[PDB]
Symmetry: C3
Subunit: 594 residues, 3 copies
């Protein structure tokens, strides 16, 4: 009939629970309203053709006609000859001579009649009389680089010693040439290095005449219904052309006249987006997403008027073509196109989007200069948006289910609140409380810590009654004023003010009761030992979520600025640097003879 | 009083539950410690100005002064004239003549006095006496490309037949020219194609004299307090300059002298980051994140000393300007700048970050050559980090709530463990067990499978007692040694060793008892049929999480390397290729006359 | 003994629950099968070397040998001299003279003997007799740009007035030159601006002879066992070479012959991936992921045969080198390489991947033209894949735990279904139902709304019995036909058909009963007031998931197309534009003398 002193730790403290009066009354919180997230997105399927700023020059075929005049002064000596001069000059071939000699016969006159220093001057091949010479192809002739000439020889004079002799070579040259024009196209340059200070689209028939010409009107001429001739097979072409001719002091250049608007565009077809999705979730903007491309393009809801664009005719033409070609190939039997024409938008970063919506059979029943850079932002827009939408959708789904689960699981908590309102209110409040059901509502009283040392009684027998025992052990403790309380060991370290927990005594009685950090072992209503229960059972579900690791994105380049500038056979600046030093490098230019 | 043989499937097996002794005792696992993830990040708001490596040349205005000497040899014939020679040469205009004739009067002398082949030589326009000729503007004169000349004519000699005549043209030319200097700036080049082998910042006053000059000291001269004159309105400028003059063998070039450090910088302003956030979560590094830019820049915690940078003066100057301008515009009333100066860092990929922290009013109370490439890594750093931080934060939040929920829900499991310790321990252990509460701890015994065929008894009446019935059906089975057991059908296919489940008989008795894969139907304490219960009730919450789909990022380029190299009017290498073939193409250079 | 009219709102409606017959019987839905997501990925560790398309020209050292012939015509006057002509021409130095005079003595003959206009011509320095002159270095000589010449003077004739005098300068020049060849390498260009129309790898020994030569066979020559000499220290090199010589009309160029396959490759080493992971999860493809690089490269499972590549010899050579070097440095003691050679693949976007798997010590016991652009797609592939895999893994983990948790928590629901089948079935069905356990299955009946006004009875005393009271209040209501029902207030607004809920009366009786939107207060079995219970207790766990915000990725470029084209000292096209205007700008070319 002795006593064992109980031991309490912080976490495993003893508690007294004063009876709850109706002073504080609580209800179990009703089911919450669940978060409803964006279920369904607003969009349009279609076909798109993306256009970029045209950066390429206007390229066209042309012919250069000139006579290569070389004048050589030789000083004939005793046992040698020395070139004292070799003066070279390209001279134009008149239009008359092109059409009437060169096209007509494939011959060229052995003389030149041109203006130099404002004086009318002449040059005769071999210092001889004019003869129409045949134009023979060069040995080096190749596709797009054919040339014809009249001589393989450069005339030089063979004379008497102690004299200066002058010979004159005249080689008539016709060359297939490639021309290039860079915006605004007020000039062009030929494969020969010659720049023509005139518009390639300059003509005399209306529209064309309001194009630049840096040359006097007499230097230019057009020849309508001109049927070109091959200077090898001397055959004419089946279709005629308006042939432009410009006579400069060093050559005559010819090219086929064509109207600017047909030949040139300020924009260029970049890519086709066969499965283009136009998103309409964000307001006042469209977002053109392409799975194929891995790119999103943001534009306004309002269309681009292509009349604002200088030379934007190619857009609608090339866009309708590819869209119509795609439709035929991919949607002909499943869908129908919308609105008898494609829609055109100005997307972020200088991209022009020509989009045409796809309608399923079932649902059918101020001047602008567009500058384009990279499409790097658009792929990033794509990547980000694809992930953001997914994780947003999925967390939405978790949030709702978390709410829904807790709402359902309230049935379990209400049911427990009828039976054990205290353990429910302790879980809810997160602090040790005593509770009583006052019908359909709980009365709450807080539980207070027992600081004065607690002692367990060795026997569990009712003193004065055989056959009746106490179900849980007896304790002695200090709470409030009364220094000693004849109490009982309740549940989860609650000490009971009274001793009313009873049971008829049973044979082979084994009990483990929680007492502080551990357990007290009782055998046949008598204290035995202070045991430990190290074995546990868990109804928990493991959720191991690991973190998304740090990643370092270091600068990465396939080719550098240096590598990209070093691809050429020659570098103008590098050559000039070295070349312009030649006089200072191999001569004393600073010395002066007295 | 017959029997029906029960049918067990794998999943719906019969079990016998031996009584649990205190041999194995368990506790319900206490509430766990919950994961606490990084709640709050360390950062600094501010304003930044990003600087990139200067790739642009130093551009400045200049003037070229030369006399264009053309000497023509004409051979007058019977009925013609032929140019046998036309020798062209640019000659310098002496400084004396620039200041005393050209600036003073707007005139130029009709002769040239220069050195060629180390000999002092002269050239007279029209082979006549020296006259100061007025400089008239060219017809083609435009903004930044003005030129003045003295003649429109090229003098040629008109003489007697059978003779060689020589005429001399001298055109004095002054041209507005644009100059460019590329690092290290020891030379410059003019719009005319001429390279000047000297520093644009070379002077004679201290500092400037230790700059390259590839020319003899006599060829150079500075003119202090020089007031320039317009050669059209012959008005002088209000402010004077130090005027540099360099006389080369072919021209005199003049330019305004300026000190290198003022005019040139090795870095260039790239972008302003108005809302720059400097992250301080990772140690030994700063991360400059810009929402505006969509870029993160990683640098050291230690500042960049701009004294390590060759020509880094522009940085602090231009950074303070833009930061101060931004502050005035965006933060003037809400915040205050910090530390009387902006901080400077060397970020990853060659970016210089000039950052100045923003302090809210409430909180206020070895030589370096910087190489820059792309900012592609920085946008990727940004994207990745923005997503990683969000998903890490959100999963952290799920992890904690999962722990917290299970911790709360332990109140429900403990409560059940008092009432039904077996069903709790079976859920926990994940295997069929029998359990008994030994006070505050459970005794566990495992349940064993009944392999010997089971039979249900047709009646549920107590033999020998009217008015008392068995609550659940009677069974017969084989377990351990004893071949026949007079048992009862327990819960969820548990077969009971005994027959102690009793109830006073009731009128209109209908029962469905689980027996193997299905149910046994009993009516008024008598077997009827083997029914199926196909209807279910579920308290589950659906969570449909779908996977983030695979995405293919295919190579994408707006303009190729080819497209970017093809934008020019001429290509030096292409022209040279064709041009240097001309002799081989239109002549036989290999033939020799015997 | 009066009555108070109850008030019902939508959400807090009154219900009558008809008794359930076995008409509808339900079971609680058994535990579900849980989703099992991809646990474990298939991959190979190794080392990789990435190769890109070679964009760089073939660069090699060379020497240019020529004699700079200048012929000057001076007209001596009264008090002056005028240059009437200055004709410049570069002439070749014969191979004989290079080896026998220039290499042998470091001297060059003061005359030139060359062919011009098909005529054999001579040039004498100072119009004097041939002398072997020493080659002296230029003042400007620098590393890689050395030059040697024979004179600093340009010979001019000083004569009698009224006469034309002609002088001849011959300067023999040898220059260290840099050569460049661009694919297909059928020509090369020198630092001087000269293009050599021949292959740098053309030779006469087998293999080399099937390479382009645009020159007659006599113009070329190889010199085997040639030991070069420094023209400063007149020392010979220790190792000999096969020396190529090509005599063009303007110079002799020499270079060391080397075989094409050794000197040139169509691919170039880009980066080393020390920790390259080759993923094998997607079928019919490999994915080469590099943490270091932040890039993923997609290729076929089938290797690249490098015999399909024109000049692909560098790949295997350079790949084995770096891989073997890396292994030695990082894996020598932990792993072993696999398969006696590296594997080679053709990745997406023109990248060649040379991968060699790493085997841990423990586990050991048609013609192709490759075009490369950017690696932008590969970093995006990397970023996306890294995130996708993580979030997919983590949601998988949530999905399984959600299933597992609900499966466990079924133990709680079954247990409640025995005690309160109605509250379980109401939670499950999401509608108010009455339920009865018919053994191991529930009988369900739906609950109907009470529309006819309800009234609570002021007393809770059993009329006719003292000491016995009703536990819950009495009500009067209208349901079905019977206009008045002597009922009782049940749980959660259920009205009971009968009045069988009883309790022995207790002293100090306080009760709150739910009645519609609120509560009814009862004191000592008598009505008092209609109270409100505003205080709640919650067992809910907060889960605050916020959305991933929209981000705008705006176009961002470090340097523009314009900025990148403006880095050069000169621009060929810009210079030519201005230069070719000179005649039109400073002269009247259109005027003609009559
Ligand atoms: C040049 O010479 C070749 C023969 O070597 C000949 O075929 C060709 O027709 C000649 N061309 C001219 C224009 O004389
Ligand atoms: C050139 O001629 C035009 C008239 O055609 C005239 O206006 C201009 O002043 C002249 N220039 C010179 C330098 O003679
Ligand atoms: C050129 O002159 C310098 C002296 O000014 C001298 O050192 C050099 O050797 C000379 N070169 C030749 C080739 O005469």
């Amino acid at each position: 009939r002795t006593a064992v002193r109980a031991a309490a730790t912080e976490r495993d403290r003893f508690y007294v629970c004063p009876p709850p009066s109706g002073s504080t009354v609580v209800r179990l919180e009703p089911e919450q309203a669940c978060p409803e997230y964006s279920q369904g997105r607003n969009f349009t399927e279609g076909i798109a053709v993306l256009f970029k700023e045209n950066i390429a020059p206007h390229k066209f075929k042309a012919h250069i006609y000139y006579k290569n005049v070389i004048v050589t002064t030789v000083w004939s000596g005793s046992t040698y000859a020395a070139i004292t001069n070799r003066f070279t000059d390209r001279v134009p071939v008149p239009v008359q001579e092109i059409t009437d000699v060169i096209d007509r016969r494939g011959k060229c006159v052995s003389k030149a009649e041109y203006v130099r220093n404002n004086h009318k001057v002449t040059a005769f091949d071999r210092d001889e009389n004019p003869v129409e010479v045949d134009l023979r192809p060069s040995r080096l002739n190749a596709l797009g680089t054919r040339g014809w000439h009249t001589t393989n020889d450069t005339y030089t004079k063979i004379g008497a010693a102690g004299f200066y002799h002058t010979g004159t070579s005249v080689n008539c040259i016709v060359e297939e040439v490639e021309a290039r024009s860079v915006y605004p196209y007020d000039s062009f340059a030929l494969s020969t290095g010659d720049i023509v200070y005139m518009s390639p689209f300059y003509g005399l028939r209306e529209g064309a005449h309001g194009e630049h010409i840096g040359y006097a009107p007499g230097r230019f001429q057009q020849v309508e219904h001109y049927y070109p001739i091959d200077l090898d097979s001397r055959l004419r072409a089946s279709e005629s052309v308006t042939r432009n001719f410009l006579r400069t002091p060093h050559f005559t250049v010819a090219w086929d006249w064509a109207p600017k608007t047909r030949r040139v565009c300020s924009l260029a077809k970049w890519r086709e987006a066969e499965e283009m999705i136009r998103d309409e979730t964000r307001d006042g903007s469209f977002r053109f997403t392409s799975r194929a491309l891995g790119a999103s393009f943001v534009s306004d809801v309002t269309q681009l008027d292509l009349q604002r664009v200088h030379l934007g005719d190619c857009v609608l033409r090339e866009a309708s073509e590819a869209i119509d070609a795609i439709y035929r190939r991919r949607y002909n039997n499943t869908h129908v196109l919308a609105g008898d024409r494609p829609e055109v938008y100005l997307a972020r970063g200088g991209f022009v989007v020509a989009f045409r919506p796809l309608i399923s059979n079932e649902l059918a029943q101020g001047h602008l200069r567009i500058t384009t850079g990279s499409a790097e932002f658009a792929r990033l827009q794509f990547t980000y948006d694809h992930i953001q939408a997914h994780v947003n959708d999925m967390l939405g789904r978790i949030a709702t289910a978390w709410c829904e689960l807790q709402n359902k699981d309230r049935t379990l908590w209400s049911e427990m609140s009828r039976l054990n309102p205290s353990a429910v209110a302790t879980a809810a409040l997160g602090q040790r409380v005593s509770a009583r059901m006052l019908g359909d509502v709980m009365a709450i009283s807080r539980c207070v810590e027992v600081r004065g040392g607690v002692y367990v009684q060795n026997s569990m027998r009712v003193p004065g009654e055989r056959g009746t025992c106490y179900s849980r052990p007896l304790v002695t403790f200090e709470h409030n004023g009364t220094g000693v309380i004849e109490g009982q060991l309740g549940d989860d370290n609650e000490l009971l003010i009274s001793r009313d927990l009873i049971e008829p005594c049973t044979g082979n009685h084994r009990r483990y009761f929680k007492l502080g950090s551990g357990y007290v072992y009782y055998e046949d209503y008598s204290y035995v030992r202070m045991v430990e229960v190290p074995e546990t059972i868990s109804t928990r579900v493991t959720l191991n979520l690991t973190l998304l690791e740090d990643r370092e994105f270091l600068p990465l380049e396939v080719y550098t600025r240096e590598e990209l500038a070093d691809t050429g056979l020659l570098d103008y600046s590098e050559i000039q640097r070295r070349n312009q030093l030649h006089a200072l490098k191999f001569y004393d230019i600073d010395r002066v003879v007295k």
